[PDB]
Symmetry: C2
Subunit: 746 residues, 2 copies
């Protein structure tokens, strides 16, 4: 039949049963017997048993993370022992008190993150001689009630294929002895280890990663309960502790209260590539550090948040030895805290051939001598967000704890070239010299600078090749029709969240500049509360392909007593994508609709208040593939869609008030592959109501009398029409056979 309650789907070619997040109270045994990998995460399962998977042994991989989704998960001894194929077991966030007993010797990956396991035992682990990755992090941390972690002596010795061990966010006090030398990655972050001896990593010649962050933490202003070493002292790492760590590429010493870095740590580390020294006390070492001479293959240096409490120095003080970091590509210096960036201050960085990212986020910087960036060899990313420049469980266990890892710049903007991010500063107006002597900036972010100026056509004269311009969340005054026109190569413009002046009827508003661009493809005017323009009422462009106009007031613009804005988007001759969501539309006048550009392939009018839609108007849009009408108040479909379109591929109608499907609504429009009727008021689906590929029906108040059998037997026949979330296609009616999926009835 149609698989249930999981959604099968095949890949490499494995056969995954996505079965997560479904209010499942037990491993379903209708799981069906072809599945390898299954995912039962985020369900209400509270027991596991040798029964649970008793007829399923092609399973390479099981994910039971986050069960039950609030007791704990109760897993009996040997439960999994019969799965001889089982390579990957994920058991995160299950409130386990122990490593389950009698796990299969086949396991290569075992995750036990975010439980209550305080004992690491031979009996739990030592039989798992095929383990490559073992995750035991986040069992005892912060102000959780938990025990010190007891690691049986030698427990890791038999694991001679162990490559990744993670024990972070456990109370360990010492690095465990008897680590197998197969290890490539060892994570010991936040484990309350004060001291690293010579002996602790002696044998680990294969190690490429070592993480000792958060041992002797810097606790000032911590966003979590933080226990420093006595007197807030430094971690203590024996001079010889890394002497055989010859293969190390990654070394994380964040928040280890370091004031000094022992250059000898790096003697026998010729491959070190990433060094993380955030949240320490290294302003001295940054000015004067001899370790900078030991790292000719380093590519990423993170020295963020090394500020001294009570100091806002004039300038940043970079050692001349920075010039020896020949391989350096990214330098992170957020939160050093200083007032002013001078050209001379960064001289030591200027001849590094590969330095493409400089990160100065969050430094309370007031002035920058911008011309210094030109004198670098090869800067691609100049990141100055969140400064003071002016004119002119809460933590994800699978992510970096000490900073976000999202790119500094959106890839869509960075793709165009050199990027300068000055977002979240106080450049509240751009004077004639603001951008003098910058490199050829292609991507510029001026978001959240509370800019209130009248852009006039001259402000970006010195960086006239910007291709992607972010001016979101300012308060721009559009009084001048020449605004931004000096940017001939402009392709993407984001003017979102500039409501300030748009809201005021009494002031002028001029959007004429849009037409002057010959290369403009994407324009976002969202959340601007646009409701009146001055003189020219129409948006015009031969180029534009995408216009986002959500969060404006087309309800006023297209008011019944006003003809002025009736052709507002018609002049966008190239438009394929239009977004009119969140415009408080109760209806669209037929004439306004008919003046939407005939080029559209994609139209969103979701999250308005439409009670009626004139389906017949779709005749004037022969290219239209996607029509999105979700989150309105629509009552009525049409029985003759196929007269009105032969292009429509996707029709999205969730969150409306549709109670009937018309006979032959659907069956005639053979372009239509995806129909979404979820969260409507449908009691039933008549026989009459097949080129359809996906049909969504969840959250409709179905009647489960015998007149639903029409539908069921259809479902049975068209097994290649994906119906998602069958678990949420539920009977509201009658008393029985109620509450249960329509798919389980006689």
């Amino acid at each position: 039949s149609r698989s249930y309650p999981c959604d099968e789907k095949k890949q490499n070619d494995s056969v995954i049963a996505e079965c997560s997040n479904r209010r499942l109270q037990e491993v379903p045994q209708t799981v069906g017997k072809y599945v390898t990998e299954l995912d039962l995460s985020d369900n209400f399962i509270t027991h596991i048993t040798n029964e649970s998977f008793q007829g399923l042994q092609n399973l390479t991989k099981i994910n039971l993370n986050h069960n039950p989704n609030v007791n704990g998960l109760n897993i009996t001894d040997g439960a999994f022992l019969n799965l001889k194929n089982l390579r990957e077991l994920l058991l995160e966030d299950n409130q386990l008190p122990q490593i389950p007993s009698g796990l299969p010797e086949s396991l290569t990956e075992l995750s036990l993150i975010q439980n209550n396991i305080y004992n690491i035992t031979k009996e739990g682990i030592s039989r798992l001689i095929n383990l490559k990755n073992l995750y035991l992090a986040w069992n005892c941390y912060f102000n959780k009630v938990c025990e010190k972690t007891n690691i049986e002596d030698g427990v890791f010795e038999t694991l001679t294929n162990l490559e990744l061990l993670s024990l972070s966010f456990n109370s360990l006090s010492h690095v465990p002895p008897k680590l197998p030398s197969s290890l490539r990655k060892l994570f010991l972050s936040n484990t309350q280890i004060k001291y690293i001896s010579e002996e602790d990593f002696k044998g680990l010649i294969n190690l490429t990663l070592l993480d000792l962050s958060g041992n002797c933490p810097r606790c000032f202003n911590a966003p979590f309960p933080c226990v420093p070493c006595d007197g807030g002292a430094s971690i203590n790492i024996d001079r010889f502790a890394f002497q055989n760590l010859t293969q190390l590429r990654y070394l994380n010493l964040s928040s280890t209260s370091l004031r000094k870095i022992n250059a000898a740590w790096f003697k026998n580390m010729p491959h070190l590539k990433v060094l993380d020294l955030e949240f320490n006390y290294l302003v001295g070492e940054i000015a004067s550090g001899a370790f900078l001479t030991m790292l000719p293959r380093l590519e990423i240096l993170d020295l963020s948040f090394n500020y001294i409490k009570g100091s806002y120095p004039q300038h940043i003080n970079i050692s001349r030895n920075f010039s020896k970091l020949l391989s350096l590509r990214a330098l992170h210096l957020r939160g050093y805290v200083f007032q002013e960036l001078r050209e001379d201050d960064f001289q030591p960085l200027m001849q590094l051939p590969n330095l493409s990212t400089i990160n100065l986020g969050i430094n309370f910087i007031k002035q920058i001598d911008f011309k210094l960036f030109q004198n670098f060899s090869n800067l691609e990313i100049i990141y100055l967000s969140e400064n003071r420049i002016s004119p002119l469980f809460e933590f994800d266990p699978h992510s970096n704890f000490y900073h976000f890892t999202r790119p500094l710049i959106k890839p869509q903007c960075a793709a165009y070239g050199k990027a300068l991010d000055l977002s979240l500063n106080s450049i509240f107006f751009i004077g004639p010299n603001q951008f003098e002597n910058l490199p050829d900036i292609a991507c510029l972010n001026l978001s959240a600078n509370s800019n209130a100026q009248v852009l006039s056509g001259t402000e970006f004269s010195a960086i006239p090749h910007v291709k992607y311009l972010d001016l979101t969340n300012n308060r721009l005054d559009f009084d001048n029709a020449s605004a931004l026109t000096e940017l001939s190569d402009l392709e993407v413009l984001d003017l979102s969240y500039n409501s300030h002046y748009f809201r005021i009827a009494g002031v002028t508003h001029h959007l004429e500049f849009i037409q002057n661009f010959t290369n403009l493809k994407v324009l976002n005017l969202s959340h601007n509360n646009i409701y009146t323009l001055t003189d020219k009422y129409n948006l015009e462009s031969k180029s534009l392909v995408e216009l986002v106009f959500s969060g404006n007031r087309l309800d006023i613009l297209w008011n019944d007593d006003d003809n002025r804005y009736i052709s507002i988007f018609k002049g966008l001759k190239n438009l394929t994508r239009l977004d009119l969501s969140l415009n408080r539309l109760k209806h669209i006048p037929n004439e306004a609709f008919l003046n939407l550009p005939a080029s559209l392939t994609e139209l969103h009018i979701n999250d308005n208040m439409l009670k009626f839609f004139n389906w017949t108007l779709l005749q004037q849009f022969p290219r239209l593939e996607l029509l999105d009408l979700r989150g309105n108040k629509l009552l009525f479909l049409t029985d003759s869609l196929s007269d009105f379109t032969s292009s429509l591929r996707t029709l999205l109608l969730s969150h409306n008030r549709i109670s009937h499907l018309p006979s032959g609504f659907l069956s005639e429009v053979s372009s239509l592959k995806h129909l979404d009727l979820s969260s409507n008021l449908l009691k039933t689906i008549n026989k009459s109501a097949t080129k359809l590929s996906m049909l969504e029906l969840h959250g409709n108040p179905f009647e489960c009398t015998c007149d639903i059998g029409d539908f069921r037997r259809w479902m049975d026949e068209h097994l290649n029409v994906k119906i998602p979330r069958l678990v949420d296609v539920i009977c509201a009616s009658p008393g029985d056979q109620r509450g249960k999926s329509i798919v389980s009835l006689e």
Copy 2:
């Protein structure tokens, strides 16, 4: 049994509006006088409709049908002390024939009536107020309005006539001299002669606005007179309007104002001259000589297009406006205000409001405000100061009428409003030489400074400070403490720095204030503080903490914020709404102030609520738990409180009420259970005044009989919106109001 579908009240109105009603409902009582059926689906009125209702003094059928109303020739005729009939927004193509002569008020606003006839109107000999406005305007498809000669002659008790937003072209002749108020705004009248206002000697208000409009940048379809010319008002046109108190000539394209216009208006009090071309008159202004009793003068939006002069130019003759209380000069547009510039206003004894909003002012010489006699409201919002149907037919069309300053702030004394400027940083001298400001608005100034306890030293008696929508860096434990008398502090929407984990955040200054009553910390994304984790005050009564991250502050692995509100020792109102809460750790709940009388935790994601903890809140009268995901009420509420008066549980997932009621909590007058998942109420006295139940999926089999009988019995237990307490089961009953 129980009133339906209307809702009655004493002081006798039958609130029957907005109900999906398709016709007038027959079930309505003789005692009822005022029927309000506005916003319904009603499409037909006849003499049947109001058969036997008799006693109505007032009917409202505005907005019917809610996407024309067909009214028959004598429908209202029989009830003959009907004084007020309201028929707005009904797409009437005509005035209804055969209206009772009892009418003192008729409103036909927002219809399609283009013919005003004797046949319709002249019988209505008792009309005092007649509204015919907004029948033909803008780009509406409509006709010039035909006013049958002398139609208003017979109405000798007519006091108010409104014909605005109709194409008239001429003031109609033969108006009754009984008139007090004549509204002719936006009527396309180009010409006002001596003969139009005859006398009309009792007129107190005349509105000629929007005739010959100033159309530049108009927010509606605007048609000017030829070449954008001025309305033409004969020098003697108002010579017999001796009683006039209100004159509205906004948007009539005036470049000149004739002093003679005012010679015979010795009582003129409000003069509205907005959206004209009066910069020249403002500078030279001989008419200012003729208005010794004028109290409000609005000269807003008289800017010269494309002109941004250095200074504003105010005639010396403004010194003759001896009764002036409020002067509105928005939208003149000028760069700088200097002390000289306002000399002519400075000896005016009663000038309390000066409104300079929306002028793109870049600098003000602030000491000038001191030299005025007695300013109470100094309104400089929306400038560029830096560190030193769409229109409601019942409101003003040319400007908002809300107060300039919130009454709660202005009530403390002298007000200075500098909101929406660019005072991004307050320097030591910013507030020198100001008067004794009690109410200060600095909202939306992009302010990112670290307030330090010295910024308001020159105005140390501020009692109500609005710092909302800035980007304040809260990095100093002494911030704002120089304001000893401060009672109301609004810090909403200062997210910028709070949301950054790695910068420091300091809210300790709170405890310093001895008179602080109300503090608003809403929409700040507060989730981590530096060193001091607790909010403390002996004085504070109300804390708004909505739109922060208590979900994080009270995270299970963190004990630091577990007492965060405990030190607010005098707190009685607390708002914890919109904090993304799934559960509150019992210990965190028990540390809320025991002084609480009102607690809001609405619009979180609560799955569970520990009812027994209410034992520690003996003063608690309101508990608001709306918009969560709660499943289960307790059956022993009465063990956990004897104080609770209001319990709000709308929009949760409750599907069963336990016996007895929940309990019998004898203090409980108001229970809201609307929009839950309730199938039934079975058995099973109360002290409830009100039970809300609308929007639960009721089963309408014979088991719902239990509850009905209860309803029949406890008739003084108000159950609102019975139209919306409907069955979702079974099919045949489903749709219907349980009560039938």
